[PDB]
Symmetry: D2
Subunit: 255 residues, 4 copies
């Protein structure tokens, strides 16, 4: 049983899918269109021989996050994997950064990770097994201007991830944080557009520029690729891979 | 020297912050103190530094857990001192427990002061520093902003958050005469640590984290802050300066 | 696929050689049964990598005997403990010769073909000592940090050409529990198998965009 | 200040090294310069620093590409100046080229100077510093000791090794009144970079501040590291890169 937050879109959907395909029962979560979401839940459950549940908890609130985990154990019988992926973005200079936006990014991008982890650990320890996979970002290791809340939160996730690993040292549980580079999800398309209109160029020229500025390989990372990474971390080969970061950024953090 | 400059140091009524405010005052910087404790002892410290170093020293008891109070502290510093060259975001609290036993109220509190206050203070200071063409933002993080320790999930997450926030601050101000850096201390024997010293007694703990087996002093951190505030550090920005007796090398 | 695991005669290199076998890759052993147990062309080249010529050779020696080169695993390396002042200049150059220079030679001989093919997976076996240090191991830690940095440059030089380069930084393996207690929080050694799977994973097409980085398999070593 | 202390600065006949030796001299420390160049030009610099700062200044043209010469520089320093409090391993060289087009000659050269010299120089100084109860090894690494660039494999490789070596040096000396740290600078407009400028937009790619780092600033940094306020700063890197590594 694997619970993946914000798994109704982009990266989360990729990791949810890739885990289903490994025989794990999935608990979807996130927003968007209800009809399309049910179509995703049913599809995955019938495309792979596994139980797929949907819990639309709003992770911007601790209780709701812990609630998602307790109810996930109550309806699935157990929780093996917790992929804390749900996240949002907002760009502006520090002095123009709305407090409300700062609060929202910290509550979802960082605090949800704490609440989910805190509710999951008790079940994982008692069962002698556990896999906590936090979706941080290259921005959990380096920074970019105008993304203070995001960079702070992502760095927070990396830090919290390490603590989780140390508290669970050898108990059959491991906590890690994938740190993706650009992934052309809706979260990045909004920026591509912003860049496209900023320099009066077309949607595809801005995409290439935004990509070359940070990504050496000049190629976007994929949810499927990220799913493959999440699956590996879930594997037995990664039994001793804990409290670390795994960068899938095509050279972003190398230079 | 820092004559003619104004430094605001949060949580400077004691510990690390007091050593930093003192070191800066000894360089001729005007100072704005902040923090809690005994009001009489705070006034003695405030008047004492002003007299000993011949600088102007004000006190502002803003409760840093409140965003608007943090921004108010910076703005009133500018209104009363005339400018703000150095912002030292040092105030912070701790709490130990397993992630599962970690009180939510404790999580929110650590984050609000240890991380959010750095944001609020920095946001308030930036506009003034950009206009001034000069600026030095010094965030007191910790070795825990680079590595972790069990039972300190909130603290480590916040500290790491500060490190990241510092890098973003540096990038948004790069080339404008402003730098942003995070000093990351190792063990420093102050009230925040003597409390953990006594705790372990009911059950020389440097061997664990600090390879040199020596404590870092408020004075040494004050000297590091004075260095980052100097002109030789004009191109030192968006980075961490570890003062941890080897903590992070191994 | 064709993978050249150096120092794969024993320990970690063996584990990596083994795992790449199970995935259907033609192993090109090295160092000082599997061909049948896995159904692959397993060769042996005892070329001593402590010589840039031997290394640059061991590579091309596979481009002709295997006809192809897809995966290069620079694993071979030695260790010597001694204070910096008491550290033999002989050993220093030895540790740097193999542990670091061999990677640059092997990599220098591999890239030309990988770029031609349009596919490559350079996997260097560094160490936690490529990110952190320990007293009395100045040559190892230095070389390892060196590998780490070299790995990053190899990645930037091959970014977007279908070739990646990463560094696995293993923690305590087995080639006592008080030794673990001090560096490994999990208190459980890392196995060549796990390293094999990791190397396997890094070779996966899922790690296509994973380049110029390090994968710490240390049971928590670097986390604290 | 640094009155009574002796500081050896490798490759200090010009550029960064000279700026560091000059800042240390200004604090009152006796200086041992090292490097190549014109005999009269070097003497002018040597005699000038000594006269201007009121300290003793020796010049040793030892070739640091040789392990014994490097160790000889240090012993000669202790022989002439009577002690060694500060060692700044700064001499270095550069060569750009693809890993495949990279001359093995250049690879081993860059490694012996940029990396082995730090080792040799440090081994020679430690016995003296441990006996003294005080020491400061200041290695001049680079932003490339933490991150990398294309076509500088040997350079990046060497710098990272220095960074790692610095950490071991610190652990092996922890608590003995000795610290070892590595300054990692970004672009400094000197010959090492002027040869690449030919081969305000060169900064634009790596240095956010769009301003070069100066030898004076690196010297001020070496001075801070040698001060007592830095007694507990050891085994770490100090980046002076205008934001290079922040992003
Ligand atoms: N796209 C990138 O370039 C990229 C790469 C590095 C890391 N990241 C991280 O990847 C993760 C996934 O983002 P993505 O790029 O797939 O974006 P996305 O918008 O496509 O997906 C975000 C998901 O979060 C869910 N979500 C938002 N608010 C929520 C709330 N309050 N409660 C519950 N669910 C909520 C959404 O419904 C959605 O399914 C985020 O944590 C993001 O910061 C993004
Ligand atoms: N003590 C150590 O060993 C150590 C290790 C490295 C990093 N740190 C960091 O150093 C900083 C200083 O801590 P310290 O060790 O001097 O502890 P301390 O408790 O002695 O000092 C904390 C200061 O914060 C002020 N403060 C607390 N809450 C406040 C609020 N809401 N509003 C305004 N002021 C408030 C206090 O009045 C006090 O002056 C903290 O950010 C801490 O996390 C400390
Ligand atoms: N300038 C930069 O942009 C930059 C970037 C960060 C790091 N670095 C590092 O700074 C240090 C100094 O570089 P610089 O820019 O001042 O260059 P430089 O060439 O101006 O100075 C190098 C000095 O080293 C001496 N030297 C060269 N080979 C020697 C040998 N074999 N033995 C003894 N001395 C020798 C020279 O005589 C010269 O005085 C190097 O270690 C370099 O890697 C420089
Ligand atoms: Mg460590
Ligand atoms: Mg970088």
């Amino acid at each position: 049983v694997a619970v993946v937050t914000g798994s109704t879109s982009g990266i989360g959907l990729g990791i949810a899918t890739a885990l289903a395909a490994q025989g794990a029962d999935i608990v979807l979560n996130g927003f968007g269109d209800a009809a399309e979401i049910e179509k995703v839940r049913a599809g995955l459950a019938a495309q792979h021989g596994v139980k797929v549940l949907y819990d639309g908890a709003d992770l911007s609130k601790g209780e709701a996050v812990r609630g998602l985990v307790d109810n996930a154990v109550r309806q699935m019988g157990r929780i093996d994997i917790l992929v804390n992926n749900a996240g949002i973005q907002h760009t502006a200079l520090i002095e123009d950064f709305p407090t409300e936006k700062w609060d929202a990014i910290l509550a979802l991008n960082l605090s949800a990770v704490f609440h989910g982890t805190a509710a999951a650990l008790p079940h994982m320890k008692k069962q002698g097994f556990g896999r906590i996979i936090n979706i941080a970002s290259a921005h959990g290791l380096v920074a970019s201007a105008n993304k203070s809340a995001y960079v702070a939160a992502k760095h927070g996730v990396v830090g919290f991830t390490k603590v989780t690993a140390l508290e669970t040292a050898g108990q059959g549980i491991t906590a890690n944080a994938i740190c993706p580079g650009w992934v052309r999800s809706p979260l990045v398309e909004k920026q591509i557009s912003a860049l496209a209109e900023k320099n009066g160029v077309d949607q595809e020229t801005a995409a290439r520029e935004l990509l070359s500025e940070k990504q050496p390989s000049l190629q976007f990372v994929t949810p499927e690729q990220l799913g493959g990474t999440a699956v590996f971390l879930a594997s037995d080969a990664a039994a001793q891979i804990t409290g670390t970061t795994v960068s899938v950024d095509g050279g972003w953090t190398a230079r």
